[PDB]
Every structure is written in C-alpha cells, then in structure tokens.
Amino acid sequence: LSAEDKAAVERSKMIDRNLREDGEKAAREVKLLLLGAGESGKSTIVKQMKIIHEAGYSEEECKQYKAVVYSNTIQSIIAIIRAMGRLKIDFGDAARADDARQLFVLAGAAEEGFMTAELAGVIKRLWKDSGVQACFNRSREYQLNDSAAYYLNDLDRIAQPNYIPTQQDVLRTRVKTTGIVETHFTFKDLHFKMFDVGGQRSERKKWIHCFEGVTAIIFCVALSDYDLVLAEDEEMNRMHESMKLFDSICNNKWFTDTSIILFLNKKDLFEEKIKKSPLTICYPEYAGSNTYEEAAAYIQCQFEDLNKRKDTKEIYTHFTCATDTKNVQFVFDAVTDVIIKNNL
Amino acid sequence: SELDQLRQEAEQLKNQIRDARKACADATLSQITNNIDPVGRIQMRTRRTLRGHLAKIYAMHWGTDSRLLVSASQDGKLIIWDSYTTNKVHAIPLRSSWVMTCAYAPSGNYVACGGLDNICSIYNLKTREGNVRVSRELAGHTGYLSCCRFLDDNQIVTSSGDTTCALWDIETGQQTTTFTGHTGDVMSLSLAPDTRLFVSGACDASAKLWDVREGMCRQTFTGHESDINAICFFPNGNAFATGSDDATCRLFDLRADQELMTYSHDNIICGITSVSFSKSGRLLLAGYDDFNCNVWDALKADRAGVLAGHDNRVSCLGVTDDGMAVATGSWDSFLKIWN
Amino acid sequence: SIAQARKLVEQLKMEANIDRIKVSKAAADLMAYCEAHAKEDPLLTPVPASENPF
Ligand SMILES: Nc1nc2c(ncn2[C@@H]2O[C@H](COP(=O)(O)OP(=O)(O)O)[C@@H](O)[C@H]2O)c(=O)[nH]1
C-alpha cells in the first residue's frame, strides 16, 4: 500500500501511452477486405498493391517465385494433356505421345520446380502441337489455369539457366495460401490495410464477423466464368455460385455499414471469350446481343440487382484486368476517391 | 469381398457402443439430483473492469497464480493484466491481429496466441534482454487457430478450423502429434486436470476425447444440434461441459460415455461462446451472444442467475484456479472480473 | 479401400471396447464431488467479504 510497487503503475501508464498513440494511428487507416470465389483475382489485386504503391518486387524476392513459376508451368501443361484424354483429342504429330509420357516421367511428384533442358524441350514440343492447341482452345470444358499460356508461351525465357522471374511472372503466379494474407501501403496521404482470406478454407461462418466494420469490400468476379461449371457438382455454374456469394456478402448484416466495390475482373479474357461463347450458356433467358458491351452490361446488372438495400447501399462497379498494373493503378485511384468522397 | 468384413464389422461396432450406452442408462442425473437443496440464486457484481483494448476481444486466460491474465483483441495486442491493481504488465504487438485465441502457460513464463494467420505464436515473458518479441511461431495448421493450451513450458496443444488438433514441441517448434478425426472446424479444446488427455468441441456438433501420449481419439460425444464453440472439463476430470450454437450447454460423462444433462431455457436462443465451472463444479458459467453470461446449477439444470455488464457479446469466460473470481471478455473491448 | 475401412474399424473398436459405468453411479459421483467441495467454492459461498482479492 502506497510505496515502491508504484514502479509498475508508471509502466502501466507507459504502455497505455503506446496503446493511445497506436490506437489513434489505427483510427485513420483504410481497411479493405477482398472477397470473391477462387481464381477471381483477389490474390493479384493484392500483389498489384505492392508493385504500384510500395516496393514492387526486388530481384531478391523475385528469384523466390522461380519454383512456383516452373510448378505452374508444368502443372498447366499436364492438365491440358490430361484434358486431351477426357476430350478425345489427338496429337497433331503422333511423336508427341512419347513427349507426353516423358513429361510425366521427368515431372516427378510435388517436389518443386525442376526445369531442365530436357524437360523444357518436351514441354515446348507439346505446347507447340496442334492437338494440344486444339485442346487448349476447349479449356472451357475442364479446369485450366489462367496463366497457362502466359508461362507456356514464354517457355524459352523461363527455361533459361540463369532465369529470374520478372514482376509480371510474379503477378501471374498462383500460389495456394491458407493463412489470411495481408498487405499495408500508404497512398494519397492515408495508410492502407488490405486483406485476403482466400486460402482460409474453413467455415466462413466462424470468422466472417471479424471484418464487421471494414472501410470497404472489393468483391472480385471472373467474367469469363460464365461458360464454366464446377468439377464436383457438374450442374452448378461458376458464374452463379459467385452471385450467391455476392448476395450473401452484399446483404450481410456485418457489412451493413461497409462500402461494396465489385471488380468485374478478367475483362480481357471475357472480351475474347464472348465472341466464341454465348452469354446464354450462363444466363439462358438472355435475349441481348452477344457482344462485349451488352453482355458485360447484362452481367453488371445481374450482380448489382442482388443488392436488396438498393436505396440504402451503392455498388461501385469497375471493370478490370487485374494483371495490368496500369489498369489496376487507375481503377484503384477511382476507388480511393470514391472512398474519401463517400467516407473519411 | 474383404471390404465387407470391415464394413459389416464397423456397422455393428457402432450399435454396441450405442446399446452399451443405452444399457448404462439406468437413470438420470436430474432424477437423482431432484432432491438436493438448490443453489437458489446467488448474485455477482463487477469488482474490476480492464480498459485498454480497442477492437473486440476474442479470448482471455487466467494465470495459475489467479492474479494475472492475458487477453487477445483483434486490435493486434495481447494485454497481460494484473487483475488486482488493474495494471498493464504487458501489451504484446501481434504480427497478425486476426487473433482468435490466447493461452497463459502454467508457469507464467510463457503466453501463446494465434488465429486467422494459422500460427501459434509463443511469447516468452522472461526476455531478460528486456521486452517481448515472438519466440516461436508454431506453423502447420492449414485452418485458423481456434484454441491452444500449454501442457507445460515444453508443450502445447492447439485446435484448428482445419478440423484437427495437434501437439507441438515448443523447444523445436515441430508438430509432435496430429489428432485427426473431427469432420468439422475444431472450435475449442480442454486439457484434463492432469494434462493426461483433452477434449475438443467442433462444428460437426461433436466433442471428442484424445489421449495426449497415444495421439488417438478415445470417446466421441454427440447430442448438440449445432456447432460447439466452448468445451470445459468438470473439475474432477470425469465429465465436461460444452457450449453450442444450438443455444444449449451440455454436461457429458466420460465413464458413462454419454450426456447427462442439457442446460436450456426458452427466451434464450443465441449461441454460447464460452463455458466454465466453479471451483467446486456446482456452477456452470456460459458466455452468451446476447452480451450476458448465464450461470447454471451444473447438477439441477436451472438458471442460478446471470452476469450483465457488457455492451457487445461475451466472447470468452474465465474462472480462477482458486475459484475466487470470474473474468469475462467482450466484443465491446472491455474485460470484467466478477465476484 | 481396405486400408481406410480397417483404419475405421480399429477406431470403432477403440470406443466400443471401453470400461463403461451406469448413469446413477456416474451421476451420484458428480453430485458427490460437488457436495464434497461445496464449501471450498467462493462463487457459491459469498466468502469473507473483507479484503480478499477483490
Ligand atoms: N488473363 C487474366 N488473368 C488474370 C486476371 N486476374 C487475375 N488473373 C489470373 O487468374 C488466376 C487466378 O487469379 P488469383 O488472383 O490467383 O485468384 P484468387 O484465387 O481469387 O486469388 C491467376 O492465374 C491470375 O494471374 C485478369 O483480369 N486476366
């Protein structure tokens, strides 16, 4: 009672000061939660924020993706070849059959990225083949990686002995993470906090409320999934599952005061796909013209329509190509502004 | 062929466990208690309020000394409080604020936490060099860390959203044992008194018994109509209580291998976030979604009262080893000590 | 297939072949333990309100 035990009370006071200052710093930062199905682009937007608003990637960090690049590469070629079996597609040149076997021989189990002169040639022979190409064109009929062609077309560069992933290579890589991914950056005078709970494959129900009160959500959508299914339910359309998700997220009680920002991503892939495939596949009752403008607009209207508090909340749609830094740079800037004009 | 022996063998194996239980069901905990003098209704008042967390608090844990306690809030800080002087002994800067759990080591030497980062961070409170930085990051889980409990400075168990619990060697940061078995996110785990074994509540609406040394599931308890977020051992170690989304708390007996009682009441439909027993085990304390902590007669199954003093939900409970006081954590960022 | 089934069977065996007890014994025992320490519990017994801890 009243003496030297007061030495701790001043430390207690010191601690509070730190809490205070920090808590103040914590009250003027922008928190963005990325959401949306797998493969929608969340991860890329995250990496974009690091190339645009922060250090980008140093030769050091870059060489540390060299394996994933090779892995993705191999993973991609294998999936296509396998895809030829299910689709009953031949090789343009029969000698490829041997290469296919060697692909699997060399490409051992999941160690890491191998990349040898022998394996490089093999993959190059396969990718170049007309049947493989014929199959690649039907990537809508099976699960296929989006950066397949990206890496495969650049096999010569990638395969090089002294190769080093470029920031693009890094951006195009898709690594499966299970923990929450987070990134910070300062931009336009404010500090930012962006998180991706993509790989957090668990019961959403348990942790969702942890984000109640985020500044805003950026919900990504893969426009090109309109003609894709789910290799598990078969009948379930991917574009539909995303909408269900959106409906859930959009009208979610925890997000009642949060700004919603749809990123209708993969517009570049959609632009090419819509020529070939009718939106009618995804939306049977679609009587519009099968053109980018009308089709893209239809989809936009479908998701925004899900919003039930239409008079209470506003959906800030933006069309993107997450792999384009310039495009991401610009859109984010419009996002940032809407954000301040809307809130702060 | 041979696949049938196994299948058939399995099918019947369940029945016997079932029937065996049915067999032992000669009476009810309630009937045999019906005559006891009821606790009546005793009251509690807040003796302390710990202020210092900004965000919601998701977990707290009393130190074996019954005075100090940790608390994890998603404000990125573990604050180690002095429940007596209310002094902040520590504020640990988390490398990831998505903390869902915190544990205080029996020796008051360490403290642990983790969450959406899927890691169990061990903090050595004795950094003679000065203050604290992470000592060990126990990584292996592929789902959020829902709970963790040190056995002793050398070992700690963790439950995870990836449906498993595990035993780790702190000294080396390696994973000792993988307790597979639950088919749903493991929300809570409870260390038996002798730290010999533990139980875990999950989203598959089942609790389980595990042999720490043997690393396998002994018994499996069912009955909850929804997820289980809290699990707690009856002081003697031959029973335990579980908290659930189905708005109920339940007492299960180990030796009898089944549920003895359900603690429910109409006009109470929110989920339970935390459970705890009084020093004697007569009272069962459950932290509720509706900002309150409800107190029940662990033997009689009625409401002995309720602790109201929170503005957001009660997310975590805590009874001192000396049974002297109760602690409550809340989404409202405050912690209270009740007597 | 076989490897999984066997893994299950052996687990079932583990829970099935255990030393069980009847409720009344189990129940009474708990009721017992409670009534046993009923005095050594500060949250039941409004202990010497003087200065102890809080
Ligand atoms: N062509 C193209 N590729 C994209 C686009 N957005 C992302 N990607 C790729 O499609 C795949 C999935 O993206 P990712 O960000 O990994 O999705 P997440 O699973 O939601 O994180 C990756 O190969 C990305 O590089 C886009 O707009 N166009």
PDB file of N, CA and C and ligand atoms in Angstrom, chain A residues 37-44 145-147 171-172 174 196 265-266 268-269 320-323, ligand 1:
ATOM      1  N   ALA A  37     -14.996 -15.673 -55.127  1.00  0.00           N
ATOM      2  CA  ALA A  37     -14.590 -17.050 -55.392  1.00  0.00           C
ATOM      3  C   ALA A  37     -13.128 -17.215 -55.712  1.00  0.00           C
ATOM      4  N   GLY A  38     -12.702 -18.466 -55.780  1.00  0.00           N
ATOM      5  CA  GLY A  38     -11.320 -18.745 -56.088  1.00  0.00           C
ATOM      6  C   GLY A  38     -11.093 -18.464 -57.550  1.00  0.00           C
ATOM      7  N   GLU A  39      -9.881 -18.011 -57.861  1.00  0.00           N
ATOM      8  CA  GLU A  39      -9.486 -17.699 -59.236  1.00  0.00           C
ATOM      9  C   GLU A  39     -10.083 -16.390 -59.776  1.00  0.00           C
ATOM     10  N   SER A  40     -10.784 -15.647 -58.929  1.00  0.00           N
ATOM     11  CA  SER A  40     -11.410 -14.405 -59.357  1.00  0.00           C
ATOM     12  C   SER A  40     -10.436 -13.222 -59.485  1.00  0.00           C
ATOM     13  N   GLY A  41      -9.252 -13.323 -58.873  1.00  0.00           N
ATOM     14  CA  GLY A  41      -8.264 -12.252 -58.974  1.00  0.00           C
ATOM     15  C   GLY A  41      -7.802 -11.582 -57.696  1.00  0.00           C
ATOM     16  N   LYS A  42      -8.483 -11.876 -56.591  1.00  0.00           N
ATOM     17  CA  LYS A  42      -8.169 -11.326 -55.273  1.00  0.00           C
ATOM     18  C   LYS A  42      -6.675 -11.259 -55.011  1.00  0.00           C
ATOM     19  N   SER A  43      -6.033 -12.408 -55.147  1.00  0.00           N
ATOM     20  CA  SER A  43      -4.601 -12.503 -54.917  1.00  0.00           C
ATOM     21  C   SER A  43      -3.774 -11.506 -55.744  1.00  0.00           C
ATOM     22  N   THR A  44      -4.138 -11.351 -57.016  1.00  0.00           N
ATOM     23  CA  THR A  44      -3.427 -10.460 -57.922  1.00  0.00           C
ATOM     24  C   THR A  44      -3.566  -8.982 -57.500  1.00  0.00           C
ATOM     25  N   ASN A 145      -5.767 -23.478 -65.644  1.00  0.00           N
ATOM     26  CA  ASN A 145      -5.082 -22.328 -65.096  1.00  0.00           C
ATOM     27  C   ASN A 145      -5.112 -21.147 -66.091  1.00  0.00           C
ATOM     28  N   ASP A 146      -5.383 -19.962 -65.566  1.00  0.00           N
ATOM     29  CA  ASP A 146      -5.450 -18.734 -66.357  1.00  0.00           C
ATOM     30  C   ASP A 146      -4.121 -18.204 -66.939  1.00  0.00           C
ATOM     31  N   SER A 147      -3.028 -18.444 -66.217  1.00  0.00           N
ATOM     32  CA  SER A 147      -1.691 -18.042 -66.624  1.00  0.00           C
ATOM     33  C   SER A 147      -1.008 -19.194 -67.366  1.00  0.00           C
ATOM     34  N   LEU A 171       3.384 -11.702 -60.698  1.00  0.00           N
ATOM     35  CA  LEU A 171       1.963 -11.382 -60.676  1.00  0.00           C
ATOM     36  C   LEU A 171       1.112 -12.549 -61.178  1.00  0.00           C
ATOM     37  N   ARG A 172       1.574 -13.173 -62.253  1.00  0.00           N
ATOM     38  CA  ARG A 172       0.870 -14.282 -62.879  1.00  0.00           C
ATOM     39  C   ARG A 172       0.897 -15.593 -62.098  1.00  0.00           C
ATOM     40  N   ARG A 174       0.209 -18.244 -59.231  1.00  0.00           N
ATOM     41  CA  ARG A 174      -0.903 -18.530 -58.337  1.00  0.00           C
ATOM     42  C   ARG A 174      -0.433 -19.593 -57.345  1.00  0.00           C
ATOM     43  N   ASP A 196      -6.738 -10.607 -47.667  1.00  0.00           N
ATOM     44  CA  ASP A 196      -7.334 -11.643 -48.490  1.00  0.00           C
ATOM     45  C   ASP A 196      -7.419 -12.931 -47.658  1.00  0.00           C
ATOM     46  N   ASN A 265     -13.700  -8.539 -62.870  1.00  0.00           N
ATOM     47  CA  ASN A 265     -12.374  -8.865 -63.351  1.00  0.00           C
ATOM     48  C   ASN A 265     -12.337  -9.782 -64.561  1.00  0.00           C
ATOM     49  N   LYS A 266     -11.127  -9.934 -65.089  1.00  0.00           N
ATOM     50  CA  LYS A 266     -10.852 -10.754 -66.259  1.00  0.00           C
ATOM     51  C   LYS A 266     -11.614 -10.276 -67.495  1.00  0.00           C
ATOM     52  N   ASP A 268     -10.388  -8.826 -70.020  1.00  0.00           N
ATOM     53  CA  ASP A 268      -9.621  -9.147 -71.211  1.00  0.00           C
ATOM     54  C   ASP A 268      -9.963 -10.533 -71.734  1.00  0.00           C
ATOM     55  N   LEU A 269     -10.123 -11.477 -70.821  1.00  0.00           N
ATOM     56  CA  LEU A 269     -10.449 -12.838 -71.205  1.00  0.00           C
ATOM     57  C   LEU A 269     -11.886 -12.853 -71.644  1.00  0.00           C
ATOM     58  N   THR A 320     -12.183  -4.599 -64.690  1.00  0.00           N
ATOM     59  CA  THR A 320     -10.734  -4.649 -64.566  1.00  0.00           C
ATOM     60  C   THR A 320     -10.060  -5.799 -65.270  1.00  0.00           C
ATOM     61  N   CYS A 321      -8.744  -5.713 -65.299  1.00  0.00           N
ATOM     62  CA  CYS A 321      -7.884  -6.755 -65.808  1.00  0.00           C
ATOM     63  C   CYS A 321      -6.799  -6.675 -64.744  1.00  0.00           C
ATOM     64  N   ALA A 322      -7.004  -7.402 -63.644  1.00  0.00           N
ATOM     65  CA  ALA A 322      -6.093  -7.367 -62.503  1.00  0.00           C
ATOM     66  C   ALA A 322      -4.626  -7.547 -62.778  1.00  0.00           C
ATOM     67  N   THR A 323      -4.282  -8.193 -63.890  1.00  0.00           N
ATOM     68  CA  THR A 323      -2.873  -8.390 -64.239  1.00  0.00           C
ATOM     69  C   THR A 323      -2.211  -7.186 -64.926  1.00  0.00           C
TER      70      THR A 323
HETATM   71  N1  LIG D   1      -5.824 -13.025 -68.098  1.00  0.00           N
HETATM   72  C1  LIG D   1      -6.134 -12.604 -66.872  1.00  0.00           C
HETATM   73  N2  LIG D   1      -5.610 -13.271 -65.840  1.00  0.00           N
HETATM   74  C2  LIG D   1      -5.982 -12.777 -64.599  1.00  0.00           C
HETATM   75  C3  LIG D   1      -6.802 -11.704 -64.328  1.00  0.00           C
HETATM   76  N3  LIG D   1      -6.952 -11.504 -62.946  1.00  0.00           N
HETATM   77  C4  LIG D   1      -6.223 -12.450 -62.475  1.00  0.00           C
HETATM   78  N4  LIG D   1      -5.652 -13.308 -63.375  1.00  0.00           N
HETATM   79  C5  LIG D   1      -5.263 -14.779 -63.177  1.00  0.00           C
HETATM   80  O1  LIG D   1      -6.263 -15.905 -62.975  1.00  0.00           O
HETATM   81  C6  LIG D   1      -5.754 -16.708 -61.911  1.00  0.00           C
HETATM   82  C7  LIG D   1      -6.396 -16.515 -60.576  1.00  0.00           C
HETATM   83  O2  LIG D   1      -6.115 -15.266 -60.021  1.00  0.00           O
HETATM   84  P1  LIG D   1      -5.855 -15.137 -58.477  1.00  0.00           P
HETATM   85  O3  LIG D   1      -5.630 -13.710 -58.183  1.00  0.00           O
HETATM   86  O4  LIG D   1      -4.775 -16.094 -58.206  1.00  0.00           O
HETATM   87  O5  LIG D   1      -7.324 -15.547 -57.919  1.00  0.00           O
HETATM   88  P2  LIG D   1      -7.770 -15.723 -56.322  1.00  0.00           P
HETATM   89  O6  LIG D   1      -7.816 -17.173 -56.373  1.00  0.00           O
HETATM   90  O7  LIG D   1      -9.126 -15.208 -56.095  1.00  0.00           O
HETATM   91  O8  LIG D   1      -6.737 -15.052 -55.516  1.00  0.00           O
HETATM   92  C8  LIG D   1      -4.307 -16.329 -61.787  1.00  0.00           C
HETATM   93  O9  LIG D   1      -3.677 -17.040 -62.850  1.00  0.00           O
HETATM   94  C9  LIG D   1      -4.247 -14.830 -62.070  1.00  0.00           C
HETATM   95  O10 LIG D   1      -2.998 -14.244 -62.573  1.00  0.00           O
HETATM   96  C10 LIG D   1      -7.361 -10.969 -65.429  1.00  0.00           C
HETATM   97  O11 LIG D   1      -8.103  -9.987 -65.323  1.00  0.00           O
HETATM   98  N5  LIG D   1      -6.964 -11.522 -66.685  1.00  0.00           N
END
